[PDB]
Amino acid sequence: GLQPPPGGTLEDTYRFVTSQAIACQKHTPPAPKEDPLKKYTFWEVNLKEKF
């Protein structure tokens, strides 16, 4: 599917993430997009550049 009408610059990405200047950031409301099986643990094996 093509783009939504506001796309915007994806996430501002503040530099210094722990300070008193900025507000609370970094994935405080977690909208899915994650694995649903996150609540059930496994053994992760990372093979991103093993090939």
């Binding site: 610059t9 501002d12 990405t13 503040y14 530099r15 210094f16 200047a21 900025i22």
Partner: protein
Amino acid sequence: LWLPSEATVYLPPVPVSKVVSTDEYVARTNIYYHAGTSRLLAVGHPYFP
């Protein structure tokens, strides 16, 4: 009967392995890509940490 002459004269030096431009040993292709970051933000104090 043979004798030294001994004067001063400017003679060509040893050759130095020169540096050549990159367009010689690098061939340019036809594929162009784009990359751009979102935006970079920073809030702090202007005088001292």
